[PDB]
Amino acid sequence: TITLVPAVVTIAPMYVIQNGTVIGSGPSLSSIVVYQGLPAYILAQVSFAGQRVTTAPVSAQVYYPNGTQTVKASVITSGKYAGMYNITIMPPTESVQNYVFQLLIVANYTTSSGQTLSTKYLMSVQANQNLQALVNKEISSLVQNITNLEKTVNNLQT
Amino acid sequence: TITLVPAVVTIAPMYVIQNGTVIGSGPSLSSIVVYQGLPAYILAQVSFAGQRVTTAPVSAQVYYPNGTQTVKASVITSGKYAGMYNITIMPPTESVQNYVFQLLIVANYTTSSGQTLSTKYLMSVQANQNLQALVNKEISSLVQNITNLEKTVNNLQT
Amino acid sequence: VANYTTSSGQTLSTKYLMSVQANQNLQALVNKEISSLVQNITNLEKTVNNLQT
């Protein structure tokens, strides 16, 4: 005897690849620390009954605090991540603090039993500061003020 | 007739304590926001049934980009952190990139269910840049410049 | 902690051990440090310009 349970479509963010590096591992996140100005490639598999499905057009509502980006995630057709949908968020660099935006991943799977299932996964993608660029630029302007001051102080010595 | 339902062994990190500071709490975290250069003491409980078991010793093949350090997790029995496996990870002090370094957590639990249940947790660790350091050294180079300059102007005043 | 007494005849209390790193606000740090250094520099610039004059 084989006792079936209903199957519910899932789109889960399996890896969040940013800087060519797994910053987010597995679906054990629903908020990830992403560092701004680098593209977090959220590889989010879509599986019905744990078996990855190739027909489920993924809309992705990317809720920036300025405009809402609807990126149609490209089905991963190469790599060992193939089958999944690569959701290419690219966060602007708005560094002075953290900023909200919510990636509501919506995989709309068409079941062949006639029960079309829209599954909507909320990951709160926490755009942490990427303060590194702001720092180097501010600091370079300070180095330039210091070298000019050195030069002036040499003229004064002369 | 009393049918005992399957218990499968679970290792979940109950604490990741890093720089003496618990960055990870709950067994709700099999990914964690590690800050580079700081020794993360992954105090991970090993449980069958959801009950703590201290007869499964845990190694950790920690795949740095400078080799694999296979660390046998020592049980710290002190304080409220007692009876957890200390998976000792030592992330690089580099801070030009977020780099993927793996953490193949292997727990081999000899159960009396009839098989030696070996559970593997591949946590692909997010080496997240500890920029604080880079901030402090750059700013210190700047102050060294402020003093040198300040001494020279004062000498000129004299 | 949420202490809830169900009306089914079983009392359930949940405690959630949310142990958190209270991380330094690096943003507010860097901003104040550099602004303060800009003022130390304004005082140095001031001596320089007096020197020149």
Strand % of chain A is: 25-35%
Estimated helix fraction of chain A: 10-25%
Largest interface, with counts of residues having CB < 8 Å to the other chain, equals: A-B, 25 and 27 residues
Over the alpha carbons, how many angstroms does the gyration radius of chain A reach?
A: 23 Å
Class from secondary-structure proportions of chain A: alpha+beta
Protein name (chains A, B): Conserved membrane protein
Organism (chains A, B): Sulfolobus acidocaldarius (strain ATCC 33909 / DSM 639 / JCM 8929 / NBRC 15157 / NCIMB 11770)
PDB class: structural protein
Keywords: dimer, N-glycosylation, structural protein
Explain the overall architecture.
The structure is cut from a larger assembly and holds three copies of chain A. Chain A is built from one helix and twelve strands; from the N terminus they run E-E-E-E-E-E-E-E-E-E-E-E-H. The first copy, chain A, is of the alpha+beta class. Chain A is elongated, with a radius of gyration of 23 Å. Chains A and B meet through strand 2 and helix 1 of A and strand 12 and helix 1 of B. Chain C: This is Conserved membrane protein.
